[PDB]
Amino acid sequence: HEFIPSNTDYPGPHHFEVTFQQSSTAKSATWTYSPLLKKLYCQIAKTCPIQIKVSTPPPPGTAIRAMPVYKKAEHVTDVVKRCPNHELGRDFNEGQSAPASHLIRVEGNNLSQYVDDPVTGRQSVVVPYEPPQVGTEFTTILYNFMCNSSCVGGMNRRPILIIITLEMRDGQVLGRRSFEGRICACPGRDRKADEDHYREQ
Amino acid sequence: FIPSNTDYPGPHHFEVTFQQSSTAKSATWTYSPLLKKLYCQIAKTCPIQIKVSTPPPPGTAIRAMPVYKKAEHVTDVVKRCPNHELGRDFNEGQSAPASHLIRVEGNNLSQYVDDPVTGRQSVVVPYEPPQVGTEFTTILYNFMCNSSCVGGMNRRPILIIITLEMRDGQVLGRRSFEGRICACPGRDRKADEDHYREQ
Amino acid sequence: HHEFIPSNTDYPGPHHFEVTFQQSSTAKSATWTYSPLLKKLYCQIAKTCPIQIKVSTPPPPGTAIRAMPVYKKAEHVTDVVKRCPNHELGRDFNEGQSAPASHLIRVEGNNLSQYVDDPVTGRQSVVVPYEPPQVGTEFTTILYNFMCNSSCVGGMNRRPILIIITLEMRDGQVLGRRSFEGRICACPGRDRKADEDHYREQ
Amino acid sequence: FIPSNTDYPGPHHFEVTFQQSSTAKSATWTYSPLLKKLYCQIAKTCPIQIKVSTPPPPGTAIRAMPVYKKAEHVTDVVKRCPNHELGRDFNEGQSAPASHLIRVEGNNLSQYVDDPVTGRQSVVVPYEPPQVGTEFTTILYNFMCNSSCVGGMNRRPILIIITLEMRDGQVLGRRSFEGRICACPGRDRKADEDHYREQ
DNA sequence: CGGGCATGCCCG
DNA sequence: CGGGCATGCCCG
DNA sequence: CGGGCATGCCCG
DNA sequence: CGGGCATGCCCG
Ligand SMILES: [Zn+2]
Ligand SMILES: [Zn+2]
Ligand SMILES: [Zn+2]
Ligand SMILES: [Zn+2]
């Protein structure tokens, strides 16, 4: 209905929260998050796990929506899709049941549904919200990205921003958080450099 | 003829603002607080944030119209220099009037209006409430000739007036700010603020 | 069926075709100036620009001479040379109208000046008949007129152009051809002097 | 037939030549005599000078065929990567199959060829006599992908094989040269020669 | 008729 | 995202 | 317009 | 596992 995904955090009634645990001081590390720059550094198609949390059990049939947007205004109008070279390829499109075009995928959850909103044209994947696990503090949705931040054709070196939403069976918004995403060949280097430049300021 | 470039918040405190875009010679867009100056780059995306605390006239809408500052010119209309109006540069691909100066980018309900006997050009969008969690409705504008175009604004400054209205024309509010469309806002902003300050 | 990329290459034919330029103002704001060092004229939009034609032997009746512009740089070579959309319609010189304002090159005076618009190549030019040099005159003088400032947007913007003069037969042929960089601007002298210096640095 | 190559001047000595280019490192194109390698930026106009000794036959023409160098990749046909193919940028007029690497501009008589089952793509154009008072027949080519393109030439050196031939299949003109498509050609060129001199 | 500037654009 | 030139045009 | 950086991936 | 490299692109 709306073509400019709201970017602003807003926990809402319940206190929707997104956090990343595992850390890896390496360069070719599948994934690693930078708290100082609220930016996730993930590799191509590598298992990326984020952890959701809330204070009170949300309404029945709630959802978790993950959708990509561009950080800059000049680009934000353009739908974030998978580049031709990675779309038409066999690798990962061979019997996966997820639209070749989709950038973000959800790993290990049949209940996950990929969405192409017909008017907006935006793409996003959803899963029913889950109560953590009995002995855990958070809910672990584990995501995937199928294009580097620099894929000529798709992203094209443009910075994105993954937005995680706590939704109603109908769409009404109960929560939201966001952060910058940069898919690389190796997040060790990329992250350090960006935090060293931040330190350089 | 000659809309009222006169400020008026109205009933619902109307606040159109700008974010913190960086200062850089060739920055796509930048805004000055000392002056009400929007330094803009041709055809680039310029995000302008509109805040409204109590919004409730469904069918209400927001207009953006361009006007000349100096009085002798304010009676003249703000069109595009025939060079860009005729050129193939930004005119194909879009579904917006060849001659208007202002264009909305992230919206398709937009209305480019050519006043029948007024001759003023402006573009209206519907007022959409800010999305749950944030405070301002964000409209995306881009200007299609540089302020210095011969055949158009022959270097004469222009003011932009954003009016929120009732489905049937009735100005609930309005605001203004001078805008400049140049190759590099950063170097132009730096200079403008300097000369005015000195005096 | 025509030639796609008019060659600029000079051609002194059986007749000895030459294109000379008389003494010109070194004056900064000059109406027109020339450069044999940089072999390029510098003329003002819509100002009378003289040109000296010369030949050892005289050619047959019906023989005329063609002036056509073409971009100097290859990545621009294919674009035809027309006037900026602005000037082509601009009411400031289509009045006292005579020829299509598409055309950049016009001819002053001569009423035998018929323009061309090659349907095939969509190429624009202009042609007048070869009158033998005025009695006691070495040169057959044709006035060419240029309409857009080499820096006009929409039109040839800041993209150098070449002006090919062609000693052409009565019907489709080439007997002689000489070329030379054209540069339309506001300060012909300020420009030429700035150009030649820049050259006297290499 | 498939991977030809060996030069062959022929009846009318076929000579492929390049004019003097821009010394600049990021120029549209440059040719390296010592390295018999053409360096040009993607989609930029590359002029090539074709010459012959005697008025070649009647309805004869010229064709450009690109082939991978390494004796390994010869098998593989050389086309545009998926991205530059299904991408807007240069297919919005396309009197040229979006798949072809080599393209000709200016000429309307260009014909793009796809071999039957052993399909190789190429561009041909009727040969034309040098315009009166010139010795060079000039053809303006375009190279739609970068030799670095992942999914395309994927950094695989290639040869453009120019051949003069007669409609009746008789190929009696064969001149070939190395071709590299890249962002700034001067740089790679000087880098290519610098080291080969030393190594 | 030359000096000088503003602002687009390309390059020490 | 900074330094410096282009080149139409105004000044006087 | 050249010098420097960005960024997938080669190499050991 | 990281350091260094080529190659497209942006900063000054
Ligand atoms: Zn991709
Ligand atoms: Zn304009
Ligand atoms: Zn013009
Ligand atoms: Zn490619």
Cβ contacts of residue B138 below 8 Å, gap of 6+? Answer: A4, B47, B48, B49, B50, B130
Span from the CA of B145 to the centroid of ligand 2 (angstroms): 3
Phi, psi (deg, nearest 5) at residue B164: -95, 135
User: Which chain A residues have a beta carbon less than 8 Å from that of D85?
Assistant: 84
Is A44 an interface residue toward D (CB < 8 Å)? Answer: no
Span from the CA of D181 to the centroid of ligand 4 (angstroms): 10
Considering only the beta carbons, identify the residue of D44, D105, D133 that sits closest to C78.
Answer: D105
Any idea which residue has 């010459």 for tokens? Answer: D51
Q: What's B185's DSSP letter?
A: H
Helix (H, G, I), strand (E, B) or coil at C124: strand
Q: Are B178 and B153 in contact (CB under 8 A)?
A: no
Q: String of b and e for C131-144 (b: at least 16 CB within 10 Å)?
A: eebeeeeebbebeb
Separation of first and last alpha carbons in chain D: 37
Give the number of other Cβ atoms within 10 Å of residue A60's Cβ: 9
Considering only the beta carbons, identify the residue of C75, C174, C177 that sits closest to D44.
Answer: C75
Q: Are D50 and D62 in contact (CB under 8 A)?
A: yes
Q: Are D198 and D55 in contact (CB under 8 A)?
A: no
Helix (H, G, I), strand (E, B) or coil at A15: coil
Q: Where are the domains of chain D?
A: 1-199
CA distance A194 to A159: 13
Length of chain A: 201
Helix (H) or strand (E) holding B85: helix B82-86
Cβ contacts of residue C37 below 8 Å, gap of 6+? Answer: C196, C199
Q: Which of residues 116-135 of D touch C (CB under 8 A)?
A: 128, 130-134
Helix (H) or strand (E) holding C115: strand C114-118
Any idea which residue has 């993954």 for tokens? Answer: A162
CA distance D123 to A164: 50
Half-sphere exposure of D116 (CA within 13 A, CB side): 2
Cβ contacts of residue B8 below 8 Å, gap of 6+? Answer: B171, B173, B174
Strand partners, A33: A40
Q: Are D83 and D150 in contact (CB under 8 A)?
A: no
User: Which chain A residues have a beta carbon less than 8 Å from that of D151?
Assistant: 85, 89
Report the residue of A44, A78, A85 to disrupt the D interface, i.e. the one with the largest count of D CBs within 10 Å: A85
Q: String of b and e for A108-135 (b: at least 16 CB within 10 Å)?
A: eeeebebeeeeeeebbbbbbebeeeeee
CA distance D67 to D45: 20
With contact defined as 3+ CB pairs under 8 Å, the chains touching C are B, D
Cα distance from A192 to chain D (closest Cα, Å)?
27
CA distance D80 to D153: 8
Cβ contacts of residue A171 below 8 Å, gap of 6+? Answer: none
Distances (CA, A) of D17 to B11, D21, D138, D171: 76, 12, 9, 19
Q: What's B8's DSSP letter?
A: B
Cβ within 8 Å, pair B131-A173:
yes
**Cβ-count burial of C100 within 10 angstroms (0-12 exposed, 13-18 middle, 19+ buried)?**
middle
B149 is in an annotated binding site: yes
Strand partners, A184: A43
Tokens of B106: 């992230």
CA distance A103 to A82: 5
Right CATH number for D1-199 from 1.20.1250.20, 2.60.40.720, 3.40.50.150, 3.90.1280.10? 2.60.40.720
Cβ contacts of residue A145 below 8 Å, gap of 6+? Answer: A42, A44, A45, A46, A48, A103, A104, A105, A181, A183
CA distance B129 to B111: 18
Q: Is D10 left (phi over 0), alpha (psi -120 to 50) or beta?
A: left
Is B157 an interface residue toward C (CB < 8 Å)? Answer: no
CB of B155 within 7 Å of some strand F atom: no
As its CATH architecture, domain A1-201 has Sandwich (2.60)
CB of B147 within 7 Å of some strand E atom: yes
Any idea which residue has 């998050």 for tokens? Answer: A33
Strand partners, A136: none
Nearest to D27 by CA among A162, C74, C59, B186: C74
Bases of chain E below 7 A from a protein C-beta are: 1-4, 6-10
- For Cα atoms B136, B140, B146, give the angle at the middle one, nearest 5 degrees: 135
Dihedral over Cα of B31, B36, B42, B47: its sign: positive
Helix (H, G, I), strand (E, B) or coil at B38: strand
Nearest to C42 by CA among C163, C198, C197, C166: C163
Span from the CA of B89 to the centroid of ligand 2 (angstroms): 11
Phi, psi (deg, nearest 5) at residue A91: -40, 110
User: Which chain D residues have a beta carbon less than 8 Å from that of C74?
Assistant: 28, 45-47, 140
Cα distance from C153 to chain B (closest Cα, Å)?
7
CA distance A27 to A189: 5
3-state secondary structure A143-201: EEECCCCCCCCCCCCCCEEEEEEEECCCCCEEEEEEEEEEEECCHHHHHHHHHHHHHHC
Q: Are B110 and B45 in contact (CB under 8 A)?
A: no
Helix (H, G, I), strand (E, B) or coil at B65: strand
Distances (CA, A) of D148 to A72, A186, D72, D106, D152: 28, 20, 18, 27, 8
Q: Are B97 and B77 in contact (CB under 8 A)?
A: no
CB of C198 within 7 Å of some strand E atom: no
Any idea which residue has 């090159």 for tokens? Answer: C105
Cβ within 8 Å, pair B134-A2:
no
CA distance A97 to A109: 12
Cβ contacts of residue D50 below 8 Å, gap of 6+? Answer: D14, D15, D16, D17, D62, D127, D136, D137, D138, D139, D162, D164
Helix (H, G, I), strand (E, B) or coil at C198: helix
Tokens of B62: 């927001």
Length of chain D: 199
As its CATH architecture, domain C1-202 has Sandwich (2.60)
Q: What's B74's DSSP letter?
A: H
Nearest-ligand number for the alpha carbon of B78: 2
Helix (H, G, I), strand (E, B) or coil at C127: strand
Q: Are D32 and D185 in contact (CB under 8 A)?
A: no
Phi, psi (deg, nearest 5) at residue B179: -130, 145
CA distance D174 to B27: 52
**Strand-strand pairing, D175-181 and D37-40:** parallel
Give the number of other Cβ atoms within 10 Å of residue B151's Cβ: 21
Helix (H, G, I), strand (E, B) or coil at B161: strand
Q: Which of residues 68-127 of D touch A (CB under 8 A)?
A: 81-83, 85-87
Considering only the beta carbons, identify the residue of C5, C174, C177 that sits closest to D106.
Answer: C5
CA distance A175 to A16: 6
Cβ contacts of residue D60 below 8 Å, gap of 6+? Answer: D126, D127, D164, D165, D166, D167
Cβ contacts of residue D92 below 8 Å, gap of 6+? Answer: none
CA distance B98 to B86: 8
**CA D174 to chain centroid:** 12
Q: What string of DSSP letters covers A23-71?
A: ----SS-SEEEETTTTEEEEETT--EEEEEE-SSPPPTT-EEEEEEEES
User: Which chain B residues have a beta carbon less than 8 Å from that of A172?
Assistant: 132
Q: Are D17 and D51 in contact (CB under 8 A)?
A: yes
Separation of first and last alpha carbons in chain B: 34
Tokens of C86: 């602005």
CB of A113 within 7 Å of some strand G atom: no
Distances (CA, A) of B191 to B153, B198, C51: 20, 11, 47
CB of B155 within 7 Å of some strand E atom: yes
Q: Are D34 and D95 in contact (CB under 8 A)?
A: no
What residues of D are designated binding site?
81, 84, 145, 149
**Strand-strand pairing, C18-20 and B136-143:** unpaired
Strand partners, D131: none
User: Long-range contacts of range A76-81, CB-CB < 8 Å, 24 or more positions apart?
Assistant: A76/A4, A76/B45, A76/B106, A77/A3, A77/A4, A77/B45, A77/B105, A77/B106, A77/B140, A79/A121, A79/A122, A79/A123, A80/A123, A80/A154, A80/A155, A80/A160, A81/A123, A81/A154
Considering only the beta carbons, identify the residue of B44, B106, B132 that sits closest to A173.
Answer: B132
Helix (H) or strand (E) holding C88: helix C85-89
Q: String of b and e for D93-114 (b: at least 16 CB within 10 Å)?
A: eeebbebbbbbbbbbeebebee
Phi, psi (deg, nearest 5) at residue D66: -105, 140
CA distance B81 to B64: 19
Nearest-10 Cα torsion for C184, C187, C189, C192: -50
CA distance C10 to A16: 78
**CA C178 to chain centroid:** 10
Q: Is D36 left (phi over 0), alpha (psi -120 to 50) or beta?
A: left
Any idea which residue has 């935090």 for tokens? Answer: A195
CB of B184 within 7 Å of some strand E atom: yes
Give the number of other Cβ atoms within 10 Å of residue A141's Cβ: 23
CA distance B121 to B98: 11
Half-sphere exposure of D9 (CA within 13 A, CB side): 7
Phi, psi (deg, nearest 5) at residue A186: -170, 95
Q: What string of DSSP letters covers B100-131?
A: -SEEESS-SS-EEEE-TTT--EEEEEE--PPP
Q: Are C31 and C25 in contact (CB under 8 A)?
A: yes
Cβ contacts of residue D1 below 8 Å, gap of 6+? Answer: none
3-state secondary structure chain D: CCCCCCCECCCCCCEEECCCCCCCCCCCEEEEHHHCEEEECCCCCEEEEEECCCCCCCCEEEEEEEEECCCCHHHCECCCCHHHHCCCCCCCCCCCCCCCCEEECCCCCCEEEECCCCCCEEEEEECCCCCCCCCCEEEEEEECCCCCCCCCCCCCCEEEEEEEEECCCCECCEEEEEEEECCCHHHHHHHHHHHHHHC
Helix (H, G, I), strand (E, B) or coil at C114: strand
Å from B20 (CA) to G8 (C1')? 33
CB of B182 within 7 Å of some strand E atom: yes
**Cβ-count burial of B16 within 10 angstroms (0-12 exposed, 13-18 middle, 19+ buried)?**
buried
Q: Are B46 and B29 in contact (CB under 8 A)?
A: yes
CA distance A191 to A25: 10
Nearest to C68 by CA among C121, C109, C12: C121
- Say what the resolution is, in angstroms: 3.0
Nearest to A16 by CA among A49, A50, A56, A48: A56
Half-sphere exposure of B1 (CA within 13 A, CB side): 6
Bases of chain H below 7 A from a protein C-beta are: 1-4, 7-10
Nearest to D96 by CA among D120, D113, D82: D113
Nearest to D99 by CA among D79, D115, D119: D79
CA distance C31 to A93: 68
Q: Is A156 left (phi over 0), alpha (psi -120 to 50) or beta?
A: left
CA distance D178 to D74: 14
Span from the CA of C155 to the centroid of ligand 3 (angstroms): 6
CA distance D180 to D42: 9
Q: What string of DSSP letters covers C11-72?
A: B--SS--EEE-------TT-SEE--TTTTEEEE-TT--EEEEEE-SSPPPTT-EEEEEEEES
Length of chain C: 202
Q: Report the structure determination method.
A: X-ray
Give the number of other Cβ atoms within 10 Å of residue C46's Cβ: 16
Strand partners, B51: B15, B136
Q: Which residue of A has its CA nearest to D84?
A: A153
